[PDB]
Design a binder for this molecule. Structure first.
Ligand SMILES: Cc1cc2nc3c(=O)[nH]c(=O)nc-3n(C[C@H](O)[C@H](O)[C@H](O)COP(=O)(O)O)c2cc1C
Ligand code: SF4
Ligand code: SF4
Ligand code: SF4
Ligand code: SF4
Ligand code: SF4
Ligand code: SF4
Ligand code: SF4
Ligand code: FES
Ligand code: FES
Lengths: 419, 155, 150, 626
């Protein structure tokens, strides 16, 4: 289509002008504008390099995955080319964690930056078939990607013998249908095979046996958008962006009680306090910050605002999601929304999570309504602390993480709910 | 039960697009649901035949994903985000407005079958909370009057 | 109140425990009739199972109906193990003890009898509290006025 | 081949096995739900957690292959494992109802057993017994009932339906806490489901219930025995659960179960009631019970003085030992011997001249399968659980469609290549018996295919081995009765009713001097007899059968059993020297009166009240897949 569905005007700001160079403006940037802006030249440079060199530059760039696990991209690619092909490359555009809207502004505004990164990466691991798995609730992004891919094929960037390099590639776009678990590497692959989204037991890992049991690489949209910059700038040049260890630009979706909610492109040495007050404009009504929710994973209190937004132990971590809560917001009520979220997304494959998430949310609901008894409390604790040990995947492993942290950082607020 | 030509062609495009037919199952279920306003249980066998898949496989898939609806028929699904950020910014105000305009609560569908309110998890537009969708279009809730003008554009 | 007398079958009167009400949907019962669901826990727990005789059927509507429940008190230990095993609050020991009779046959309780015993026991001492003895005048002959306390 | 440690105890384990397998083999009980030795590994219940010291992490043992020198710890020496067992069992019990008093699984329930041994011992998550709900849908079946709140979603049923039976009749309805099992097509009783009861048996709890068994008893009040199922030629080993007539349970068969090999079909699972139906358990003369010794004298007189005018109609539902004794007596009486299988099976095997009869285990060696004749899944059902290679077909195809068979022609067989197993059902060749046998005989010599005859009756192949060259044609025997050449008939079972209608025997009772019927039932063909002699059913005799699972020997444990073999052997004490035989042959073509069906394949399953309901619903259906 040439007229896409309606999407909100998400505000975007940047201090590096790399990933949001074009995405800072709320509109589609088609191939003609992207080319005038220098697009696809990084792909031609990469195609004049061997696949092994490209993997090497990505490893030396020290780029880590922006999907939440922080695994080093270059090493993931090296693991995949350890086994014989055919190989597959998958772009993970599921993006369904609460407060995370960073990937959509790239897809909806600069799809060619993502397409170029997919091509370079596919060439690097020797994948002639690449997939983009985008959540079902992103219809504009779906049509936009489909059309941008068609523009690329017309210009010769996709298809057979790309730019005379002998390299063949086709990018298929898959749509989800409402499941946060499909963002999990193996569940996505299962969904891509036309099955229910249940995560697989690992080992094996997808880099050895993934889509159709063949070596598959799954990378987050943000991670891939970095690949064109790594080739274009050179790996050495890229590594100097930000702190020595956590290099590269990073997208931060800031939401909640802030004046300027939106996506911010900043270096990972920035502190959470700088993110909220320096870039997002402070809090609404200038109310005091009570807590910050790293998506549905972590909970930071007002006493932890001076930490770096990196992948270090004492750092923010996660995917950079910043949900700001002020002094008039109820933590218990907030935890309930989190509990309801995990109950709604547990896939149901394994016991600790299938039942833990449901009973955790039901118990917290009784606590919140004031109908909780002493055994209800003891039971709430028991469940919250035992969902993770035997869970199969990351969902069950963190379904009680944030709620537990609010119990330790805001005990006074929780005891206000005891009879 | 047979698929009308218009819908059958769309389904064939998806089935021929992917390298393997079964990979088109989610796009086909979307196509069916957008055509009939719901996924008629009577279409799973015809779809499973086009994909060369056993019926129980197709049934298991359509049962797993949240967007698919085999019970209620609605021309427009009003997906309302009830997750943390939108809840903090006014999801309740939006639901109350939807009730004042259409007389329905989450999960219900108007008598003529025009609208159905569907509560959903984070829609990925938290910076523009409260968010809601009208089948494919995403909007920010501003006021009851504003919501009424937006809803008047459908039917 | 804790006397282990003649057995009885508590009846469907509205004061049933959560466990029985939870399975009521599966039973074919009548108001003011035995609560028994024929689980065989009493007889299985009993060291003398031969004294029991329980029978239940599956009605054509799918519900379960108890059709026979007999106990021979002359081979009973009056031990109370069966009441412990009743998961539905049906089997109980009443205060009935004047059962001497002229034939082994008069010492065999049928379901109809178990119901009548329990109905009468509940009718006369259901709200009575769990005390060491229920009447002090009958005990005064031997003990006298006892200085009770809270 | 590999040494490991479980709670610091050295244990030798064959490489390729899992820690859970090794532990169970060595008597180390580790609680588990979703692992089943016959199904693929699932790793979903997580109840089999063990602490793997080598990696300092909790791991599921059902998926942990043994490695040289590995060290694991179970709940015996690990509190971490103990805490997770209590949590997992408590989680399962959260919405599990207080249904034990009326649930059919009580006493043999994995949740009830494990929950009492490793569970929380008290309620930690306080849920009222009145709020024990989970999403649920009626299976719309008269035989199976699903209780989703009792379900501990373990996926054993789904795996068994897809990997063992292959019918693909179940699916998991909407995800998460409320994941519930639903039949792919409802009403279930006429869907692709073959009502084999395997889902009932693999279910670790009372989630999937057998309606015929509901509320009639309690699992711990029944007796148990294992024997050979003789309802078809496969030879499955099944377990009969029965009562004796004491305080625990009535003197009858209450239900039946497969073993952990999951070798069972609907006939074997729901046909148990044919054992209780109108049994003939005493020798009778007319309508009056008579002592066996007196009946033995009558028969001794009949065969000694009138053997040359006596015909014996064998049943393929007789064990080898009885067949042999009767045949030996016949050869001592100069009688006529036949079997209804002489109409089709014997004519075919006579032309084929040499066949193959490998065990089910040997089916692994085949590259492809060719089904010729009837619907194999309706004749020897369990065989369809082992024909997992390419399947070609010539003939009727109804339930066999689950194997996605490719239709071919006899001319195409010449081009197949490599270790082909041809499974042919002679009762379905209608006039092309000799032609088909001749064609397969060429194929067996030129290309070397395996030609395996699939009889529809349990011991028909042994009957053929022992009767070849000397059997009379069934129509010739009947024709000889009308002519008066045969004055006495000893008929075993009702196999004969597949070719002649009842009226024929009502008239034969008048025409014959002696009509002796050897049957397990007081109704049917035995109603027309002058002398009725009991015939044993499964679990009532120690007889061997030549089946697809080998030469299997049954066990005698049902207490009301009539000693079939002892009676015949006693009669045989009056016959020592071999006198001869008489053979009658005739070209008249007898047509089978009815086609076997998955739920009714012989006169025994016909007397099953359960299978009769299933048969009446599906008798007209001919298409289940498309
Ligand atoms: C419950 C769950 C949800 C996830 N969701 C996403 C997601 O929405 N987007 C994403 O890129 N990765 C998601 N992941 C992480 C993927 O498993 C995987 O680690 C990542 O996509 C790999 O790409 P990367 O190396 O570039 O980070 C999720 C993981 C879990 C356990
Ligand atoms: S932990 Fe939760 S999401 Fe992960 S497999 Fe288990 S049930 Fe599914
Ligand atoms: S234990 Fe109770 S419910 Fe069970 S059979 Fe005995 S009296 Fe009836
Ligand atoms: S009182 Fe003791 S001996 Fe008598 S029936 Fe009960 S359990 Fe058996
Ligand atoms: S499934 Fe087991 S634990 Fe649940 S009610 Fe039945 S017997 Fe009891
Ligand atoms: S009983 Fe057997 S055939 Fe029927 S649904 Fe269960 S596994 Fe499938
Ligand atoms: S019905 Fe039984 S076998 Fe099937 S998932 Fe539930 S507990 Fe497991
Ligand atoms: S396949 Fe034959 S032997 Fe096996 S259970 Fe069924 S009827 Fe019996
Ligand atoms: S929370 Fe409503 S859109 Fe993310
Ligand atoms: S038995 Fe190992 S996970 Fe279920």
């Amino acid at each position: 289509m040439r007229s896409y569905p309606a999407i909100p005007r998400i505000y975007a700001e940047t201090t590096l002008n790399m990933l949001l160079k074009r995405a800072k403006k709320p509109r589609v940037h088609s191939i003609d504008e992207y080319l005038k802006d220098g697009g696809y030249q990084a792909l031609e440079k990469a195609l004049n390099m061997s696949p092994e060199e490209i993997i090497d530059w990505v490893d030396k760039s020290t780029l880590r995955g922006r999907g939440g696990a922080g695994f080093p991209t270059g090493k993931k690619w090296k693991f995949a080319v350890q086994n014989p092909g055919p190989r597959y490359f998958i772009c993970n555009a599921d993006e369904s964690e609460p407060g995370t809207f960073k990937d959509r502004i790239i897809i909806e505004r600069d799809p060619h930056l993502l397409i170029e990164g997919i091509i370079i990466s596919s060439y690097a691991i020797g994948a002639n078939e690449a997939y983009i798995y985008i959540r079902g609730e992103y219809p504009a992004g779906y049509y936009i990607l489909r059309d941008a891919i068609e523009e690329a094929k017309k210009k010769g960037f996709l298809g057979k013998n790309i730019l005379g390099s002998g390299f063949d590639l086709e990018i298929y776009v898959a749509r989800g249908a409402g499941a946060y678990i499909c963002g999990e590497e193996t569940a996505l692959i299962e969904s891509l095979e036309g099955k229910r989204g249940h995560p697989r037991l690992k080992p094996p890992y997808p880099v050895q046996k993934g889509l159709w049991g063949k070596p598959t690489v799954v990378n987050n949209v943000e991670t891939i958008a970095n690949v064109p910059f790594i080739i274009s700038m050179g790996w050495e040049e890229y590594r100097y962006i930000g702190p020595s260890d956590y290099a590269g630009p990073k997208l931060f979706p800031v939401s909640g009680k802030v004046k300027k909610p939106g996506v911010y492109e900043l270096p990972m040495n920035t502190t959470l306090r700088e993110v909220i007050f320096k870039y997002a404009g402070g809090t609404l009504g200038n109310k005091k910050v009570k807590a910050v929710f790293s998506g549905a994973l972590d909970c930071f209190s007002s006493e932890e605002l001076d930490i770096p937004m990196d992948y270090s132990p004492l750092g923010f971590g996660g995917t950079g999601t910043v949900i700001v809560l002020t002094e008039e917001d109820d933590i218990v009520e907030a935890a309930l929304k989190i509990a309801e979220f995990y109950e709604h997304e547990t896939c149901g494959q394994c016991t600790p999570c299938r039942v833990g998430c449901y009973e955790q949310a039901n118990l917290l609901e009784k606590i919140y309504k004031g109908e909780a008894t002493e055994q209800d409390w003891e039971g709430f604790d028991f469940v919250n602390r035992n969902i993770q040990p035997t869970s199969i995947c990351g969902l069950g492993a963190v379904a009680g993480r944030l709620i537990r942290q609010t119990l330790e950082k805001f005990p006074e607020e929780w005891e206000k709910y005891r009879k | 039960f047979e698929f009308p030509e218009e819908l059958k062609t769309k389904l064939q495009e998806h089935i021929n697009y992917f390298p393997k037919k079964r990979q088109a199952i989610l796009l086909c279920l979307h196509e069916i649901q957008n055509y009939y306003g719901y996924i008629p249980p009577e279409s799973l066998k015809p779809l499973a035949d086009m994909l060369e898949l056993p019926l129980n496989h197709v049934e298991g898939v359509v049962a797993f994903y949240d967007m698919f609806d085999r019970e209620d028929k609605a021309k427009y699904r009003i997906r309302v985000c009830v997750s943390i950020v939108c809840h903090l910014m006014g999801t309740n105000k939006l639901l109350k407005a939807l009730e004042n305009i259409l007389g329905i609560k989450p999960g219900e569908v108007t008598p003529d079958g025009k609208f159905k309110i569907v509560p959903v998890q984070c829609l990925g537009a938290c910076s523009e909370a409260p968010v809601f969708m009208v089948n494919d279009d995403e909007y920010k809730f501003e006021s009851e009057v504003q919501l009424n003008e937006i809803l008047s554009r459908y039917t | 109140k804790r006397f282990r007398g003649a057995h009885g079958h508590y009846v469907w009167d509205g004061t049933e425990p959560d466990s029985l009400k939870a399975i009521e949907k599966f039973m074919s019962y009548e108001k003011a009739k035995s609560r028994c669901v024929a689980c065989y826990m009493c007889q299985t727990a009993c060291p003398m199972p031969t004294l029991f005789r329980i029978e239940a059927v599956q009605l054509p509507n799918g519900k379960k109906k108890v059709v026979r429940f007999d106990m021979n008190l002359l081979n009973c230990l009056f031990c109370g193990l069966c009441v412990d095993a009743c998961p539905v609050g049906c089997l109980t020991m009443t205060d009935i003890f004047e059962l001497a009779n002229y034939s082994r046959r008069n010492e065999v309780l049928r379901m109809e009898d178990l119901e009548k015993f329990a109905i009468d026991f509940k009718q006369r001492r259901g709200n009575e509290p769990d005390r060491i003895w229920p009447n002090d005048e009958e005990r005064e002959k031997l003990w006298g006025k006892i200085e009770w306390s809270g | 081949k590999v040494k490991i440690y479980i709670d610091d105890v050295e244990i030798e384990a064959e490489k390729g096995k899992t820690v859970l397998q090794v532990a169970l083999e060595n008597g180390i009980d580790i609680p588990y739900f979703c692992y089943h030795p016959r199904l693929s590994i699932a790793g979903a219940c997580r109840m089999c957690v063990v602490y793997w010291e080598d990696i300092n992490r909790l791991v599921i043992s059902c998926n942990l292959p043994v490695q040289e020198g590995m060290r694991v710890r179970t709940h015996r020496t690990s509190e971490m494992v103990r805490e997770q067992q209590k949590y997992l069992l408590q989680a399962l019990m959260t919405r599990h109802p207080l249904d034990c008093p009326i649930c059919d699984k009580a006493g043999e329930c994995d949740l009830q057993n494990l929950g009492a041994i490793y569970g929380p011992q008290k309620q930690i998550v306080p849920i009222s017994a009145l709020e024990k709900e989970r999403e649920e849908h009626d299976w719309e079946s008269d035989f199976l009932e699903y209780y989703s709140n009792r379900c501990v979603v373990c996926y054993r049923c789904t795996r068994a339906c897809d990997e063992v039976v292959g019918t693909r009749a179940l699916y998991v309805e909407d995800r998460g806490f409320h994941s519930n099992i639903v039949p792919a097509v409802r009403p279930m009783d006429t869907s692709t489901c073959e009502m084999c009861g395997i889902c009932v048996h693999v279910c670790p709890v009372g989630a999937i219930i057998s309606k015929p068994f509901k509320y009639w008893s309690r699992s711990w009040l029944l007796e148990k025995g294992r024997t050979v199922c003789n309802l078809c030629p496969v030879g499955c080993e099944i377990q009969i659960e029965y009562g004796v007539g004491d305080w625990r349970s009535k003197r009858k068969v209450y239900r039946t179960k497969p073993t952990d090999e999951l070798n069972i079909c609907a006939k074997g699972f729901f046909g148990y009631d044919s054992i209780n139906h109108k049994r003939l358990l005493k020798t009778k003369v007319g309508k009056r019970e008579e002592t066996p010794g007196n009946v033995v004298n009558l028969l001794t007189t009949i065969l000694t003085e009138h053997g040359g005018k006596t015909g014996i109609v064998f049943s393929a539902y007789l064990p080898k030992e009885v067949i042999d004794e009767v045949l030996r007596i016949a050869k001592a009486s100069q009688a006529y011997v036949t079997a209804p299988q002489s109409v089709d099976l014997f004519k075919f095997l006579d032309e084929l001249e040499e066949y193959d009869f490998p065990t089910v285990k040997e089916f692994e060696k085949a590259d492809a399968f060719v089904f010729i004749g009837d619907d194999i899944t309706s004749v020897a059902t369990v065989l369809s659980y082992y024909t997992k290679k390419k399947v070609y077909k010539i003939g009727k195809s109804v339930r066999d469609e689950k194997l996605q068979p490719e239709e071919i022609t006899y001319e195409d067989l010449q081009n197949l290549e490599g270790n082909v197993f041809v499974l042919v059902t002679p009762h379905a060749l209608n006039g092309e018996i000799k032609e088909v046998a001749t064609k397969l005989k060429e194929l067996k010599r030129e290309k070397g295919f395996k030609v395996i005859p699939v009889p529809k009756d349990a011991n028909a192949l042994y009957l053929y081995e022992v009767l070849k060259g000397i059997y009379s044609d069934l129509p010739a025997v009947m024709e000889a009765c009308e002519r008066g050449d045969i004055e006495n008939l000893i008929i075993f079972g009702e196999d004969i009713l597949e070719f002649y209608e009842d009226k024929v025997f009502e008239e034969l009772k008048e025409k014959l001097e002696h009509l002796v019927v050897v049957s397990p039932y007081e109704d049917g063909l035995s109603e027309y007899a002058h002398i009725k002699i009991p015939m044993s059913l499964m679990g009532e005799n120690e007889g061997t059968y030549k089946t697809f699972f080998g030469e299997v020997k049954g066990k005698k444990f049902l207490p009301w059993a009539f000693d079939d073999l002892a009676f015949w052997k006693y009669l045989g004490e009056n016959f020592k020297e071999e006198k001869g035989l008489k053979v009658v042959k005739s070209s008249s073509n007898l047509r089978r009166r009815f086609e076997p069906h998955l739920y009714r394949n012989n006169w025994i399953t016909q007397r099953s009240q359960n299978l009769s309901r299933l048969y009446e619903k599906n008798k007209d259906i001919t298409v289940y897949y498309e």
